[PDB]
């Protein structure tokens, strides 16, 4: 389908309120964690499901990026629109945020303690992403 582009990207975040630089990695066991560099399981496939809404699937884990309660990120093999579809919003400064409408939270690599510490701040750490091309 050539109606919308299929993008292949690595997602990379250093902030806000971040410590190190992180590549979003979807491991085969479903865990979503920080990768210090570009790896096979940090390679993401990005396709539109609505106009500005996006689904994100790790190509080597073939797990969709899905959000749980309080904003926890997990990789599930079965897509569900309410948990794994996000509005992609590109900020004026060039960073991409992926808001979940159901959970009212952005995709982030914050820990569970960080997500609770910031749950009423209007932003989560490690939620501003730069989309990087893969180096063959």
């Amino acid at each position, epitope marked *: *389908g*050539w*109606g*919308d*582009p*299929i*993008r*292949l990207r690595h997602l990379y975040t250093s902030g806000p309120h971040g410590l190190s630089s992180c590549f979003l990695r979807i491991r085969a066991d479903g865990v979503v964690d920080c990768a210090r560099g570009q790896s096979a399981h940090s390679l993401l*496939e990005i396709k539109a499901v609505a106009l500005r809404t996006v689904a994100i699937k790790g190509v080597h884990s073939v797990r969709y990026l899905c959000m749980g309660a309080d904003g926890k990120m997990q990789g599930l093999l079965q897509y569900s629109e309410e948990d794994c579809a996000f509005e992609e919003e*590109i900020r004026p400064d*060039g960073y991409n945020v992926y808001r979940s409408e159901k959970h009212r939270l952005p995709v982030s690599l914050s820990s569970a303690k960080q997500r609770q510490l910031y749950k009423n701040r209007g932003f989560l750490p490690l939620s501003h992403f*730069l*989309p*990087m*091309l893969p*180096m*063959v």
Partner: antibody
Amino acid sequence: EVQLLETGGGLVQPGGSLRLSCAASGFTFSSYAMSWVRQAPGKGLEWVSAISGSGGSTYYADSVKGRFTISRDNSKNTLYLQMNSLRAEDTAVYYCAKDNWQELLFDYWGQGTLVTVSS
Amino acid sequence: QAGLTQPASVSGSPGQSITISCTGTSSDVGGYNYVSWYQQHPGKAPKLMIYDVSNRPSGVSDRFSGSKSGNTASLTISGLQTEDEADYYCSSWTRSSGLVFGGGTQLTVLG
């Protein structure tokens, strides 16, 4: 590293036919879309046609629909553009371009093969 | 049914900064975030310099930056160096017309 070798360029008369081939090497050819982008001498770039990666989806520009045919064969890692009903406006260097995925964003380019349509 | 509009020529001296505009419509530059910029030196293949409006592939110098406002995308090259002299083509995604290009801009580094 990654290499795209276009072949089949030369002189053809208006109304003739010619098929271009692109020798892909250095990547899993079957996983990425491909495209042909052409450039008339001393003029700008024009995207010609696109292929899905598996062959199932093809995309064409208005200036070549019905006359050009994009095709692939993943066994031999080769991309095809069969140009029929050639006109003078098809005179261009024809570039073989690898898609980053299926987004019409071009990772790598061949050095192009020139197609001259003159009588 | 028309390509994107770029200025035919842009020129600056070494060390200066320049901007190349790329005007489209609400169906291309102003309708998506998939504006790309390519650099083409004489007799060579185009080279991807900017993708998705503002992002740089690895190796591309950080003197190149892309941005967009309404229907106009812009490529900016700070600290002009001699080798920056080339042709620059912007490109945008479209829903039903494939990849549409701009007419190209010849960048001259006045030496």
